[PDB]
Amino acid sequence: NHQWYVCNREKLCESLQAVFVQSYLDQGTQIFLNNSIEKSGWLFIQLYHSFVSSVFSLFMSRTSINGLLGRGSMFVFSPDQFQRLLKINPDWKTHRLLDLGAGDGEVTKIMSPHFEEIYATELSETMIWQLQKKKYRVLGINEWQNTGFQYDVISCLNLLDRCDQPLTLLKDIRSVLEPTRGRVILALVLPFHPYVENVGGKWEKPSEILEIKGQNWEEQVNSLPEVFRKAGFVIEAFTRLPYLCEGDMYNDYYVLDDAVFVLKPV
Numbered sequence: 001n002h003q004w005y006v007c008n009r010e011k012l013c014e015s016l017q018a019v020f021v022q023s024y025l026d027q028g029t030q031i032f033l034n035n036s037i038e039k040s041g042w043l044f045i046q047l048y049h050s051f052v053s054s055v056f057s058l059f060m061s062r063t064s065i066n067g068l069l070g071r072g073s074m075f076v077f078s079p080d081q082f083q084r085l086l087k088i089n090p091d092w093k094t095h096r097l098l099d100l101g102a103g104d105g106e107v108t109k110i111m112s113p114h115f116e117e118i119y120a121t122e123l124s125e126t127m128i129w130q131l132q133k134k135k136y137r138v139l140g141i142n143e144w145q146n147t148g149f150q151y152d153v154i155s156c157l158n159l160l161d162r163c164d165q166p167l168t169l170l171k172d173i174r175s176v177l178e179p180t181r182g183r184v185i186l187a188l189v190l191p192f193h194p195y196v197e198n199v200g201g202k203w204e205k206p207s208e209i210l211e212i213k214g215q216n217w218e219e220q221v222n223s224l225p226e227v228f229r230k231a232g233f234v235i236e237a238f239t240r241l242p243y244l245c246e247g248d249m250y251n252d253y254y255v256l257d258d259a260v261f262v263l264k265p266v
């Protein structure tokens with residue numbers, strides 16, 4: 001419970017202590033955990049998924065396998081947590097949303113009711129199927145920057161460390177964000193450990209290095225204002241949320257340490 005959300009606010013720098021928002025384990029988080037515990041109890045389905053995965057991981061990424069089997073869904077924030085972090089009301093709506101590296105869209109649908117048009121990018125073929133099943137407009141990874149129109153909210157959750165050019169991405173996002181009321185939602189697992197996902201436990205180094213240093217969560221968060229400022233952003237709000245993932249035969253679920261930011265352009 002509290003270990004996922006608590007923060008040593010005294011270790012944060014001046015800028016960050018003002019914009020920090022405290023999050024809590026609400027019912028939306030508890031519904032995902034209970035659903036995850038239920039799914040993980042189905043031994044034979046998990047065994048079948050495990051054996052299919054062990055064969056398909058010889059030529060397929062773990063992400064594409066999860067999208068093929070409809071498994072491994074994840075959780076970043078509840079609708080309530082998303083609204084409290086963005087400082088909006090449940091009825092708030094705007095025009096366009098762009099979710100980069102949206103995966104199977106289970107996190108995207110948390111933000112989806114607040115938008116009229118939803119766009120996504122995704123490298124995995126099977127995940128693209130999941131996004132199209134939700135009727136999102138999927139764009140190429142080098143197509144969303146050159147559409148002509150801008151985006152009110154650009155979401156970039158748990159992608160910077162899985163990306164080959166995170167610095168270019170942050171600047172590409174700034175170029176097509178709506179200047180007046182546009183906002184960026186960004187999530188990162190800390191400690192920052194970047195790698196490009198490939199096939200069968202194979203990873204590569206990113207081409208562009210983000211200078212995210214520190215020996216704990218607060219020190220690494222302190223290193224990010226410079227990174228965000230280099231791309232033309234300032235932190236309007238940020239919080240500490242557990243990055244949750246559905247489980248398997250051995251664990252009911254998995255937890256990672258997410259730092260979630262709301263960025264406004266400057």
Ligand SMILES: Nc1ncnc2c1ncn2[C@@H]1O[C@H](CSCC[C@H](N)C(=O)O)[C@@H](O)[C@H]1O
Pocket residue numbers: 063074075076100101102103104107121122123124127141156157158159162163164187
């Ligand atoms: N260059 C790229 N362009 C678009 N998607 C990418 C990408 N590189 C990796 N991805 C995708 O980004 C995802 C990272 S996992 C993040 C999934 C989801 N946004 C969440 O927070 O839960 C994977 O689905 C991966 O296939």
